[PDB]
Design a protein around this ligand. Structure first.
Ligand SMILES: CCCCCCCCCCCCCCCCCC(=O)OC[C@H](COP(=O)([O-])OCC(O)COP(=O)([O-])OC[C@@H](COC(=O)CCCCCCCCCCCCCCCCC)OC(=O)CCCCCCCCCCCCCCCCC)OC(=O)CCCCCCCCCCCCCCCCC
Ligand SMILES: CCCCCCCCCCCCCCCCCC(=O)OC[C@H](COP(=O)([O-])OCC(O)COP(=O)([O-])OC[C@@H](COC(=O)CCCCCCCCCCCCCCCCC)OC(=O)CCCCCCCCCCCCCCCCC)OC(=O)CCCCCCCCCCCCCCCCC
Ligand SMILES: CCCCCCCCCCCCCCCCCC(=O)OC[C@H](COP(=O)([O-])OCC(O)COP(=O)([O-])OC[C@@H](COC(=O)CCCCCCCCCCCCCCCCC)OC(=O)CCCCCCCCCCCCCCCCC)OC(=O)CCCCCCCCCCCCCCCCC
Ligand SMILES: CCCCCCCCCCCCCCCCCC(=O)OC[C@H](COP(=O)([O-])OCC(O)COP(=O)([O-])OC[C@@H](COC(=O)CCCCCCCCCCCCCCCCC)OC(=O)CCCCCCCCCCCCCCCCC)OC(=O)CCCCCCCCCCCCCCCCC
Ligand SMILES: CCCCCCCCCCCCCCCC(=O)OC[C@H](COP(=O)(O)O)OC(=O)CCCCCCCCCCCCCCC
Ligand SMILES: CCCCCCCCCCCCCCCC(=O)OC[C@H](COP(=O)(O)O)OC(=O)CCCCCCCCCCCCCCC
Ligand SMILES: CCCCCCCCCCCCCCCC(=O)OC[C@H](COP(=O)(O)O)OC(=O)CCCCCCCCCCCCCCC
Ligand SMILES: CCCCCCCCCCCCCCCC(=O)OC[C@H](COP(=O)(O)O)OC(=O)CCCCCCCCCCCCCCC
Ligand SMILES: CCCCCCCCCCCCO[C@@H]1O[C@H](CO)[C@@H](O[C@H]2O[C@H](CO)[C@@H](O)[C@H](O)[C@H]2O)[C@H](O)[C@H]1O
Ligand SMILES: COCCOCCOCCOc1ccc(C(C)(C)CC(C)(C)C)cc1
Lengths: 114, 66, 81, 274, 69, 96, 103, 100, 55, 89, 186, 103
């Protein structure tokens, strides 16, 4: 009942967005690159892409990593494994009798339950 | 669903009274207490109640008479 | 009297579209919040920090009902036969 | 045999996954402590602040840890635990629900047992007939022939006492279910869009190429996921604490003004008079 | 504000009206209205519902046994 | 058509018929094991399931006591309410 | 200097309601499971509900295989082990004829 | 698959617990403890270890329910029976004629 | 009692794996670890400046 | 509880006894007309509607079972259909 | 201090084979229920009388005088203003129950007062505790004796357990009779 | 909550202050009436005036009311949706099964 509290500056919000912009500026500072060896495929209009000019920053951070740059790529061969096996499976020849007796994940199969 | 504290009185509104210690002069009211043999008879009645409601366990009823 | 039980399996997938029509009606209200935050900061930039909580607060709630509207149509298909 | 009543429990990977959640708490070191301090000092002022503060800190940091392990350390239970309703109702909502009843449980219990003696609350109660009605009849209201229906009266008055503690349970359940639905539906929709795009590209191998980029799409999706989930967790916490305030902690507003003392070096006593 | 089971009082000891004033009617009418009223609302409704279902209770289990023959 | 109403047979008769059905389903397994020429241990591994089902039906039958007749139960029948005529306190007798 | 921090966990627990909170949490969760999930899910009479596609979708990573019935054969092996440990007669149950509560 | 990501198949085994046998062994352990300690009936040990069990057993043996619970003895869905008049009786007679 | 059936023991080989798509790999959030490990390492080890001489 | 189970029943007795009597009357008339018209439900539609309106379902089921038993007794049928019927005693 | 150990297995047997319960067994259980319920009231009475044997006049007037029984609802200033409450008003505010009348009589009774604390409370709790425990123990003894003198299946089980036999052996021995005589084994 | 809360507050204040007005009008002399002399011997009045006493007597009174009457109230609430429902006849026990000679 009527405590008469003065304003506390610690409860204000005048540093969160500046700090976030400081972090983002620290991020974008590592995107600075030299002119030598520079190449970027622009769009057909000649205008730049979106993701294109922000690959150097990501790979400059990958440069500074220690373990992820030597581990996180080992899941990438698995993508080509799928690319190959999918194409093998798009046209795989199978037995008609076995397909009619044991269709995979087909509906109204009483052996499954429904 | 349900009510809130904003829609009700507080724990300070209820129980708003702080403590006050009452004292009274001694005129001699707690003197000449009678019934000097009250607790003896009370204990006797209590033990009597326990005795009438006592029941010893008699397992000999389960003896194989048959 | 006579009694014919019928099980209409098409209503499994009709109601999915009937609920799907309503999933976008919150979106016009969702964008109202950020439009308000924009114009309020345009009136007073210094207040943009104190209203931004009410901006985020205004989105996730308005967005939620859309999600709840989206739940039934997804509750309608992947469990019912 | 007849006496053998057999029960089957389903046991999985629990021990080694639960140990690291606690071991990480030394690394995080309660980074949310300042935020929860600020909010608690906004919403309540009492000696038992530290208790509720510590409780909320534990709950929130556990939520944060589980979320980060759900985003990064993807193994076994860490993926399902945020997509499951039992975690969102009992591992986050129940603790926040029982926290004020564990800190201020004495006062709330006494309040409830006094509200079972339901009565009209008068401001500046300088009335005498109110006191006689409250003592003799038990209540301000007319209690004539309510013993005739006492069997229902008890339980109804009990609900009448906890009705202003029930919306807290309702809001906790609502926001737990909300977080569960958010996580589940957003994950499912995103995966579905991914699968449809992969079907289009597998059927058109001119497009089965890293068409956005190997790291661009991944970085963008990482940012999208973490930004969205951070917004949702901040919402769930801020709303949980604001509703805690507005529903349970306004009961405990007891402002005492400061009264200057005068008889410091001398105190009247029973021996001063008698 | 507008709390539950709460009422303010003025200098004359009278309840201040929050929404509606009902102190114009005479004391006889007020006593007539309030002699049968209580501090309980929903229990009477539940009791009337129970009495309706008791009036409309089932007695088939007695018909099978022959209490109505 | 259909209707939501009372159970047809009493609980005791229902459990009796269930026990008879499980007796039949166990006897059939036993007869099949005998026709196949199984020993005791193989007959056990064969028909342990139906044996347990029969034992559970027997447990249900032994667990259900039909009610005793008294003035309180008859008054509860007249009132058409589910009532326990063995409790002085009702729902609190569970905790008292 | 004496501290319950380093010399008594009991007095530390007693002097801090925020240490009572996890214990009450544990007790309430276990009581909830005991009241609701125990008999409805974990009991042998109520364990086949995990084969339901609506109430337990893909509890076995697939739709439940009813031709195989792993639950049936596991529990049958366990009941057989119980029967062999107790030396109970299989055919003694079939010699029973329960009466009916006549009248 | 997305549901495959929303699935938890990291189980290890099934813990089977005969709660009847465990309750029996608990009661046996209580009896053994009370006999070894030779504790009287007025002890808090004896009270805590005996009274609640006896109370719950006495209640479960005193219970005399005129009717069984809701979803076990009534309020059950039942197909409508055949009537002894109209179309059902005609169908019954036609069935009897065709069978015989 | 405790059991260890042979049904759980099955053949294993990485050749039989279907694998992942490009989209699923991007959603696996490995590339985010790849970037943000270096980001946070850089921030931590760049906050602490050493002494120097201005030339 | 106390009013509903110790004061209500003597007040609700006649209102229910009249309904019981009317249902028994409609039952008797309906089955009389069925005995007349050889168990045909086409002519006695007014009495069928009155029977369905006044008598409740739980009473109608018992009356149908009783008429099935009666037809078994008088030989109109044999092995009456008792699929969903109370097999009490 | 020995009947409860047998009554445990007997109660498990009765719960399992509850179908075999007679009306006389039901009445025995109902009598045990009656004794259990009256033991609470006897414990309350013993607690009151014991604490009242160690309560001072101030502790008693705390329960009689409406100044103390009105601390929840009424301001203390209403009692400090002389003439606010009349004599009849104070009389209607005083408690009228039998405990209040007992304490009113006990004002003029000599006793052995103690300071309000754990000993004044233990002097009531101990007689109440002994009363409750002894009444329940003797009730269970009476129940077991009635079962032993009861010519029924539960009586036979209780007898066989009182001989000194194991629970499993007694269950088997009694079920061998149930299958033959009661169930009519094939 | 509803917006009728101030309406209900006005009605509660009406009945309360009218009862107090009635008590003021009738004035002293209530202790000489027969109603008071019966309430002095009425257990309902004892319980009702013990509820508001201090020393945990509110909790005692509420729990006593629960243990005595609230269980029957819970049963009554459960039976409200049972009175209208079709129930079967009670399978009264023949009281023949259980008798067995001692040996
Ligand atoms: C006969 C009466 C004749 C008189 C009628 C005329 C009225 C004249 C005024 C007399 C004084 C008076 O009525 O005081 C209120 C007086 C008491 O009312 P109250 O003060 O609001 O009750 C106290 C609590 O609010 C409620 O008390 P409670 O104990 O019932 O609360 C318990 C309740 C809790 O109630 C709640 O707090 C709400 C919670 C939500 C529950 C919703 C579902 C409940 C249904 C299931 C049960 O518990 C539950 O709801 C159980 C739910 C559990 C759910 C589990 C999950 O009323 C009565 O005397 C009762 C009978 C008459 C009621 C109707 C009144 C008429 C209203 C019309 C007004 C229009 C103006 C008329 C004036 C102009 C005329 C010219
Ligand atoms: C408490 C008073 C001290 C007990 C006296 C000492 C004693 O030995 O106890 C004797 C008496 C028999 O107890 P028991 O021999 O240990 O138990 C064997 C059977 O329970 C015996 O069952 P019962 O059919 O013989 O029930 C007898 C019932 C009287 O039953 C009736 O009169 C019902 C017909 C009402 C006429 C209108 O109680 C009485 O005889 C006198 C109290 C009334 O104690 C009681 O029955 C307790 C009565 C306390 C009130 C509970 C409700 C009584 C009326 C319930 C009617 C059916 C429920 C309808 C729903 C409404 C429920 C409120
Ligand atoms: C009649 C029908 C009932 C009528 C309404 C209730 C009447 C009682 C009442 O409350 O009146 C107020 C009245 C208050 O008197 P007062 O003068 O206004 O207050 C004086 C002071 O303010 C008091 O100051 P103080 O602090 O010195 O007093 C100590 C305190 C007592 O000292 C304490 O502090 C202990 C507090 C105990 C609290 C209750 C236990 C709570 C346990 C925890 C519950 C947790 C919740 C569980 C629920 C589940 C949770 C998930 O006094 C009391 O509060 C009175 C308690 C009354 C005894 C209730 C015992 C209930 C035990 C529960 C089992 C009941 C089974 C059924 C019994 C048979 C039913 C017919 O109570 C009494 O004076 C009555 C006491 C004497 C009872 C004797 C009854 C007659 C027995 C005769 C012999 C046996 C029967 C012979 C056959 C008879 C023919 C059939
Ligand atoms: C699960 C339950 C199982 C129960 C089963 C049955 C249990 C039976 C035995 C259990 C006995 C009690 C144990 C219950 C457990 C709870 C204990 C408890 O809460 O008390 C804490 C209580 C806390 O202290 P306090 O309440 O703050 O004391 C305040 C002062 O009284 C300050 O106030 P004050 O100004 O009034 O000072 C008075 C002063 C002196 O007062 C007097 O001298 C006269 C006072 C009037 C008599 C009071 C009756 C005391 C009844 C206690 C038993 C008396 C025998 C004690 C001696 C036996 C061992 C030699 O101190 C005393 O009154 C001490 C009592 C002995 C005085 C000598 C009486 C003459 C003999 C032709 O601890 C005690 O004071 C207990 C002192 C008595 C210890 C005796 C132990 C006997 C062991 C068995 C011997 C065989
Ligand atoms: C329970 C017995 C209480 C006896 C009594 O005086 O009862 C007193 C109360 C009335 O007290 P009030 O008029 O003071 O409200 O009676 C009732 O409420 C009905 C109780 C049932 C009485 C049998 C019919
Ligand atoms: C005692 C545990 C017996 C055992 O070997 O059990 C061993 C199992 C582990 O077996 P698996 O990892 O092979 O499945 O662990 C448990 O059952 C402990 C469960 C802990 C939760 C209950 C407390
Ligand atoms: C305290 C120490 C007790 C002790 O050492 O007790 C020792 C006894 C030893 O029994 P055994 O001789 O059969 O090995 O342990 C038991 O009988 C079981 C104790 C319970 C263990 C399981 C814990 C989860 C509870 C589920 C069981 C059912 C509830 C039983 C009541 C708890
Ligand atoms: C019998 C009727 C039951 C069917 C509908 C129940 C409506 C109750 C009608 C009773 C009016 C008395 C006041 C009241 O109940 O209360 C009237 C309530 C308001 O009660 P609350 O302020 O306690 O929430 O109005 C509503 O909003 C619900 C009634 C809708 C009609
Ligand atoms: C500010 C952005 C606003 C737009 C909001 C867009 C919605 C974003 C929702 C983000 C939450 C989705 O949550 C995320 O779901 C994906 C998709 O399954 C999960 O991803 C996981 O499942 C997919 C599905 O195949 C696998 O391919 C992948 O390898 C695995 O990581 C993430 O582990 C989870 O964190
Ligand atoms: C922890 O949160 C910090 C994450 O911040 C990530 C921000 O992501 C955007 C960075 O991507 C860009 C975008 C644009 C650019 C450059 C292309 C600004 C434009 C330039 C170099 C041509 C001027 C560089 C990087």
């Amino acid at each position: 009942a009527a405590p008469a509290e003065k304003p506390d500056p610690a409860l204000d919000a005048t540093k969160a967005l500046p700090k976030a912009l400081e972090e983002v500026e620290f991020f974008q500072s590592y995107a600075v690159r030299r002119k030598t060896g520079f190449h970027l495929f622009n769009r057909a209009t000649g205008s730049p892409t979106i993701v294109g000019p922000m690959f150097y920053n990501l790979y400059n951070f990958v440069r500074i990593g220690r373990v992820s740059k030597y581990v996180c790529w080992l899941s990438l061969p698995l993508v080509f494994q799928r690319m190959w096996m999918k194409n093998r499976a798009t046209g795989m020849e199978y037995d008609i009798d076995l397909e009619n007796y044991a269709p995979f994940e087909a509906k109204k199969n009483p052996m499954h339950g429904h | 669903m349900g009510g809130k504290a904003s829609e009700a009185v507080t724990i300070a509104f209820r129980f708003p009274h702080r403590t006050t210690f009452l004292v009274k002069q001694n005129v001699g009211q707690k003197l000449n207490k009678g019934h000097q043999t009250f607790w003896q008879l009370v204990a006797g009645g209590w033990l009597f109640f326990l005795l009438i409601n006592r029941t010893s366990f008699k397992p000999k009823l389960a003896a194989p008479k048959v | 009297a006579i009694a014919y039980e019928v099980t209409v399996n098409g209503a499994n997938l009709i109601g999915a579209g009937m609920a799907a029509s309503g999933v976008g009606v919150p979106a016009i209200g969702v964008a109202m919040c950020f439009s308000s935050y924009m114009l309020a900061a345009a009136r007073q930039p210094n207040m943009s920090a104190k209203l931004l909580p009410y901006c985020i607060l205004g989105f996730a709630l308005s967005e939620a009902l859309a999600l709840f509207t989206l739940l039934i149509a997804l509750l309608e298909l992947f469990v019912f036969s | 045999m007849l006496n053998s009543n057999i029960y089957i429990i389903i046991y999985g990977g629990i021990i080694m996954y639960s140990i690291m959640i606690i071991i990480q708490m030394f690394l995080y070191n309660f980074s949310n402590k300042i935020y929860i301090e600020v909010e608690i000092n906004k919403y309540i002022l009492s000696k038992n602040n530290i208790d509720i503060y510590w409780i909320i800190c534990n709950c929130t940091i556990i939520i944060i840890i589980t979320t980060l392990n759900h985003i990064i350390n993807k193994i076994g239970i860490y993926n399902m635990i945020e997509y499951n309703i039992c975690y969102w109702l009992i591992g986050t909502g129940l603790g926040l629900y029982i926290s004020p009843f564990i800190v201020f449980g004495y006062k709330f219990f006494v309040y409830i047992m006094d509200l079972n003696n339901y009565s009209l609350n008068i401001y500046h109660n300088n009335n005498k007939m109110n006191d006689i009605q409250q003592i003799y009849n038990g209540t301000n209201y007319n209690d004539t022939m309510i013993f005739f229906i006492k069997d229902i009266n008890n339980i109804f008055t009990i609900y009448r006492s906890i009705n202003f503690f029930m919306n807290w349970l309702y809001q906790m359940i609502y926001y737990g279910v909300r977080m569960w639905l958010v996580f589940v539906l957003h994950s499912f929709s995103l995966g579905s869009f991914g699968e449809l795009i992969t079907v289009i590209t597998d059927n058109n191998l001119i497009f089965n190429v890293f068409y956005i980029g190997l790291l661009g799409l991944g970085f963008i999706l990482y940012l999208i996921v973490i930004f969205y989930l951070g917004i949702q967790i901040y919402v769930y916490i801020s709303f949980s604490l604001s509703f805690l305030h507005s529903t349970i902690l306004l009961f405990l507003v007891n402002y005492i003004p400061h009264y200057n003392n005068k008889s410091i070096f001398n105190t009247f006593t029973n021996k001063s008079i008698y | 504000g507008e709390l539950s089971e709460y009422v303010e009082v003025n200098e004359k000891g009278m309840p201040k009206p929050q929404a509606l004033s009902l102190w114009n009617m005479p004391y006889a009418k007020r006593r007539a209205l309030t002699k049968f009223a209580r501090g309980v609302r929903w229990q009477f409704i539940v009791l009337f519902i129970a009495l309706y279902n008791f009036k409309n209770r089932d007695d088939s289990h007695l018909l099978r046994r022959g209490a109505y023959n | 058509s259909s209707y939501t109403g009372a159970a047809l047979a009493p609980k005791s008769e229902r459990l009796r018929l269930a026990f008879e059905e499980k007796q039949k389903d166990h006897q059939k397994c036993i007869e099949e094991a005998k026709g196949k020429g199984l020993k005791k241990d193989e007959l056990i591994d064969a028909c342990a399931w139906t044996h347990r089902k029969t034992i559970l039906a027997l447990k249900d039958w032994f667990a259900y006591r039909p009610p005793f007749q008294d003035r309180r139960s008859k008054w509860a029948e007249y009132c058409s309410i589910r009532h326990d005529s063995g409790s002085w306190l009702g729902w609190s007798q569970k905790f008292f | 200097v004496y501290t319950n921090w380093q010399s008594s966990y009991t007095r530390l627990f007693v002097s801090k309601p925020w240490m009572w909170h996890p214990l009450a949490w544990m007790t309430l969760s276990v009581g909830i499971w005991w009241k609701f999930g125990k008999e409805s899910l974990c009991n042998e009479r109520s364990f086949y509900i995990h084969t339901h596609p609506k109430w337990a979708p893909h509890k076995f990573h697939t739709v439940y295989n009813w031709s195989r019935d792993p639950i049936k054969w596991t529990l049958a092996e366990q009941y057989a082990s119980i029967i062999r440990n107790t030396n109970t007669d299989i055919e003694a149950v079939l010699k029973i004829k329960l009466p009916a509560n006549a009248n | 698959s997305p549901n495959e990501h929303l699935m938890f198949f990291d189980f290890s085994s099934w813990l089977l617990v005969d709660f009847g046998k465990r309750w029996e062994r608990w009661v046996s352990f209580k009896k053994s403890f009370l006999t070894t300690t030779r504790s009287p009936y007025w002890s808090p040990q004896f009270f805590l270890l005996t009274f609640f069990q006896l109370r719950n057993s006495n209640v479960k043996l005193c219970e005399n329910w005129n009717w069984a619970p809701k979803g076990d003895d009534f309020n059950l869905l039942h197909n409508s029976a055949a009537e002894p008049f109209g179309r059902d009786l005609k169908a019954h007679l036609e069935r009897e004629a065709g069978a015989k | 009692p405790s059991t260890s059936p042979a049904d759980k023991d099955v053949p294993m080989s990485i050749l039989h794996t279907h694998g992942l798509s490009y989209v699923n790999w991007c959603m696996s959030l490995a590339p985010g670890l790849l970037v943000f490990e270096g980001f946070f390492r850089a921030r931590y080890y760049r906050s602490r400046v050493p002494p120097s001489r201005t030339v | 509880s106390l009013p509903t189970f110790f004061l209500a029943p003597p007040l609700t007795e006649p209102f229910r006894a009249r309904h019981r009597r009317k249902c028994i009357e409609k039952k008797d008339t309906f089955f009389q007309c069925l005995d007349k018209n050889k168990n045909e439900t086409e002519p006695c539609e007014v009495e069928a509607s009155g029977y369905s309106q006044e008598c409740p379902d739980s009473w109608r089921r018992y009356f149908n079972e009783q008429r099935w038993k009666a037809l078994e007794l008088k030989g109109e049928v044999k092995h009456a259909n008792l699929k969903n019927t109370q097999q009490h005693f | 201090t020995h009947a409860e150990l047998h009554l445990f297995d007997l109660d498990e047997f009765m719960q399992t084979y509850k179908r075999l319960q007679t009306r006389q067994d039901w009445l025995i259980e109902n009598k045990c229920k009656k004794s259990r319920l009256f033991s609470y009231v006897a414990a309350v009475i013993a607690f009151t009388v014991g604490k009242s044997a160690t309560m001072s006049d101030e502790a008693i007037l705390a329960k009689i005088d409406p100044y103390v029984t009105s601390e929840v609802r009424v301001q203390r200033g209403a009692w400090w203003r002389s003439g606010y409450f009349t004599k009849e008003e104070v009389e209607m505010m005083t408690p009228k129950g039998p405990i209040a009348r007992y304490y009113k009589f006990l004002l003029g009774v000599r006793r052995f007062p103690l300071k309000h604390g754990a000993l004044s409370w233990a002097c009531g709790f101990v007689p109440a505790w002994l009363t409750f425990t002894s009444l329940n123990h003797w009730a269970q003894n009476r129940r077991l004796n009635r079962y032993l003198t009861q010519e029924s299946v539960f009586g036979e089980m209780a007898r066989e357990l009182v001989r000194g036999k194991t629970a499993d052996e007694a269950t088997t021995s009694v079920m061998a009779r149930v299958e033959k005589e009661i169930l009519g084994v094939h | 909550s509803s917006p009728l809360v101030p309406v209900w507050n006005d009605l509660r204040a009406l009945q309360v202050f009218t009862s107090q007005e009635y008590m003021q009008k009738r004035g002293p002399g209530f202790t000489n009436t027969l109603e008071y002399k019966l309430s002095c011997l009425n257990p309902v009045k004892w319980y009702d005036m013990m509820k508001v006493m201090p020393g945990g007597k509110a909790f005692v009174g509420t729990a006593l009311g629960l243990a005595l009457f609230g269980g029957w109230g819970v049963e009554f609430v459960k039976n409200i949706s049972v009175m209208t429902k079709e129930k079967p006849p009670i399978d009264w026990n023949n009281e023949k099964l259980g008798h067995l000679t001692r040996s």
